[PDB]
Design a protein around this ligand. Structure first.
Ligand code: 2OO
Length: 291
């Protein structure tokens, strides 16, 4: 009944029907937290959408599938990927969403060197999303360059809420070992009760990606890296001398070991470093087709 129960539960939240009957010409474009992502054409209108597809039978933790469709149900923000609908297709949960044509930030940080104007623009956008998400008690729990998608004109959206979690008065903190190792907050690796603060640390690591091209310890096996994150001082930038005093001071508010001292998203929105933030157009030349 285990499988049948998850199906029936999903059936009670997803939209009715088989979306395959309304979509043409599927093209696989990626792989996320809990399933693959494809784009396709909405036949009636000619518009392109993306679809995340999560097989119930290939999950380590099936209850994660509730995250996008329960926690993130009809969530709307200029810096969050817009989801349209969800469906149950055989054993797969499908989430139909807008197509972000600029791809992911990962492709940018692995192939180019962002300037601080571009870095600030990305941070500002993510912090705006996080302040609102955190205000509602949602923790993303997998902030990294992979989770950042871009429009053609350089606007930035937070993506892949497959691992997100809800806190509340009754569940003030989460405890589960969730994330991507190199980006994990120290308190989360130490298996202490944690909150929204973990997203702030992870953003700090994403800043290190934007500067160094990869998170710290990236060439170590993941378990060793987590041990190193857990036990050592905050990671240093390899290219510290290429970073302005403003960027450093900003980053120093993020990579704080003690989560109680770590700046919050709302606090960070006031940081002087973000005044440097360029417009959406500044990001454009970094994209693959433009470089
Ligand atoms: C870089 C490949 N594209 C891609 N990978 C994804 C993984 C997870 C989610 C995701 C997710 C949710 C928001 C359902 O949690 C979305 C992904 N996308 C992508 N690419 C272009 N447009 C769109 N919309 N998505």
């Amino acid at each position: 009944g285990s499988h049948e129960q998850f199906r029936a539960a999903l059936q009670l939240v997803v939209d009715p029907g088989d979306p395959r009957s309304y979509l043409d010409n599927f093209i696989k474009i990626g792989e996320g937290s809990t399933g693959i992502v494809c784009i396709a054409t909405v036949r009636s209108s000619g518009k392109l959408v993306a679809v995340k597809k999560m097989d119930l039978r290939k999950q380590q933790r099936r209850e994660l599938l509730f995250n996008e469709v329960v926690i993130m149900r009809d969530y709307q923000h200029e810096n969050v990927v817009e989801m349209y609908n969800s469906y149950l297709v055989g054993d797969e949960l499908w989430v139909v969403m807008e197509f972000l044509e600029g791809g992911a930030l990962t492709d940018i940080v692995t192939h180019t060197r962002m300037n601080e104007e571009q870095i600030a623009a990305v941070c500002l956008a993510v912090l705006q999303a996080l302040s609102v998400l955190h205000a509602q008690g949602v923790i993303h729990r997998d902030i990294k360059s992979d989770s950042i998608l871009l429009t053609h004109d350089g606007r930035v959206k937070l993506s892949d809420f497959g691992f997100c979690a809800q806190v509340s008065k009754e569940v003030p903190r989460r405890k589960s070992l969730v994330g991507t190792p190199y980006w994990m907050a120290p308190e989360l690796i130490s298996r202490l009760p944690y909150g929204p603060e973990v997203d702030i640390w992870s953003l700090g690591i994403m800043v290190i990606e934007m500067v160094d091209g990869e998170p710290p310890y990236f060439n170590e096996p993941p378990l060793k890296a987590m041990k190193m994150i857990r036990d050592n001082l905050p990671p240093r930038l390899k290219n510290l001398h290429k970073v302005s005093p403003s960027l450093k001071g900003f980053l120093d508010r993020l990579l704080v070991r003690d989560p109680a001292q770590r700046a919050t998203a709302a606090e960070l929105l006031k940081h002087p470093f973000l005044a440097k933030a360029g417009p959406p157009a500044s990001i454009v030349p970094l994209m693959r087709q433009n470089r």
